[PDB]
Design a protein around this ligand. Structure first.
Ligand SMILES: CCCS(=O)(=O)CCC(=O)O
Length: 232
């Protein structure tokens, strides 16, 4: 059966926090609010729901990680689409950031995913696996307990074009199969692989039914409540 699912929101911020705080969540699911540096302190001050944790984003400096831990931040998102396609973080830069975060005692949501052209030319597999192999090269087996994979087709991020359940399931399954082969079937079976890209209230439920979907990464928005509820 599936490991504990995760619903993660990538960042009015005060009214959203109010709404989350008042939300009862009956089933088992880890919720994550990933905030940019400038809004971290306020989020931690305001968000008191114990099923939620706060996540930093993109920190790559040794002292920065240290300071985040000091402040009570234990989760971090790394490798998100724009980091790669705009900021210029390579597979190896992302992988180094992930190993550093794990060494500093972070839970890590590592993002991978293919471009529109890669998808169209049928190169989704080679691309996403090259990306995860770079990450895995800097980790030891035991590290995976601290790792979560977020699969996000670049063409589905903020475009309104969601992956179909078939597309998501196929991607998730090829990722899990590679992890099974290269890392261990034990690690594979416990690994959370999340889907992201145009997830909403209407489509999340159907996506979660898929065998290899363990939750979602989505925007910080009022409908995030329904995405959380769709993780069953
Ligand atoms: C405008 C963002 C829509 S979204 O759901 O595709 C965001 C996904 C993500 O930030 O990972």
């Amino acid at each position: 059966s599936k490991p504990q699912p995760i619903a993660a929101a990538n960042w009015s911020l005060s009214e959203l926090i109010d709404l989350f705080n008042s939300t009862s969540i009956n089933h088992d699911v880890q919720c994550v609010v990933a905030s940019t540096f400038v809004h971290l302190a306020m989020t931690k001050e305001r968000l008191s729901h114990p099923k939620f944790v706060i996540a930093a984003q993109n920190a790559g400096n040794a002292d920065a990680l240290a300071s985040l831990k000091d402040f009570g931040v234990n989760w971090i998102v790394l490798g998100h689409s724009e980091r790669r396609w705009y900021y210029g973080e390579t597979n190896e830069i992302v992988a180094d950031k992930v190993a550093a975060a794990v060494a500093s005692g972070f839970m890590v949501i590592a993002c991978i995913g293919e471009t529109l052209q890669e998808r169209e030319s049928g190169r989704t597999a080679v691309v996403v696996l090259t990306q995860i192999a770079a990450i895995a090269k800097k980790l030891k087996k035991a590290d995976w307990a601290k790792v979560v994979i977020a699969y996000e087709p670049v063409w589905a991020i903020g475009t309104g074009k969601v992956a179909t359940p078939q597309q998501a399931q196929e991607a998730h399954a090829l990722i899990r199969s590679w992890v099974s082969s290269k890392i261990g079937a034990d690690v594979a079976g416990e690994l959370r692989i999340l889907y992201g890209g145009s997830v909403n209230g209407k489509n999340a439920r159907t996506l979660y039914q898929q065998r290899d979907v363990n939750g979602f990464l989505a925007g910080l928005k009022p409908e995030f409540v329904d995405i959380i509820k769709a993780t069953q």
